[PDB]
């Protein structure tokens, strides 16, 4: 419900803004989910890791 | 001090045409590097058209 855009009231870029959003939330929370799947790989055991 | 036609049509109206053109270009700046509609292409931008 970000990219429901009758575009664009930014207009930046002409339908390229949310790419930066899920880009960056990919980036910051990536290294947190990294250790959260690495430490926390033991706490991601061979059960519902699937 | 006869002419006075031109003297403003020399000085005033010509520079007012020049700067009037300049502000008219400032009514087409639109702050976009770029975006457009362009039936054939991207055409980058509304600046162009």
Curated annotation (Swiss-Prot), chain A:
Q: Which domain of life is it from?
A: Eukaryota
Q: Where in the cell is it found?
A: Cytoplasm; Cell membrane
Where exactly are the transmembrane stretches of this chain?
none
Which miscellaneous remark does the UniProt record hold?
Answer: Present with 4280 molecules/cell in log phase SD medium.
Family assignment from sequence similarity: Belongs to the SEC15 family.
- How is the subunit organization of this protein annotated in UniProt? The exocyst complex is composed of SEC3, SEC5, SEC6, SEC8, SEC10, SEC15, EXO70 and EXO84. Interacts with SEC4.
What job does the chain carry out? Component of the exocyst complex involved in the docking of exocytic vesicles with fusion sites on the plasma membrane.
Supply the name of the protein.
Exocyst complex component SEC15
Organism this protein belongs to: Saccharomyces cerevisiae (strain ATCC 204508 / S288c) (Baker's yeast)
**Gene giving rise to this polypeptide:** SEC15
Q: Which residues of the full protein are shown?
A: 406 to 455 of 910
From Swiss-Prot, chain B:
The cellular location(s) given in this protein's UniProt record come to: Cytoplasm; Cell membrane
Question: What family name appears in the similarity comment?
Answer: Belongs to the SEC8 family.
Annotated function = Component of the exocyst complex involved in the docking of exocytic vesicles with fusion sites on the plasma membrane.
Describe its assembly: The exocyst complex is composed of SEC3, SEC5, SEC6, SEC8, SEC10, SEC15, EXO70 and EXO84.
Q: What name does the UniProt record give this protein?
A: Exocyst complex component SEC8
Q: What lineage is this protein's organism placed in?
A: Eukaryota, Fungi, Dikarya, Ascomycota, Saccharomycotina
């Amino acid at each position: 419900d970000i990219n429901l855009n009758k575009a664009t009231e930014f207009i930046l870029v002409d339908n390229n803004y949310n790419s930066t959003n899920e880009f960056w939330d990919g980036l910051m929370d990536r290294l947190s989910p990294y250790l959260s799947y690495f430490i926390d790989e033991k706490l991601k055991t061979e059960e519902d890791m699937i | 001090s006869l002419t006075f036609f031109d003297d403003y049509m020399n000085k005033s109206f010509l520079p007012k045409i020049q700067m009037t053109m300049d502000y008219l270009f400032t009514v087409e700046v639109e702050s976009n590097n770029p975006y457009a509609l362009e039936l054939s292409d991207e055409n980058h931008n509304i600046f162009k058209t």
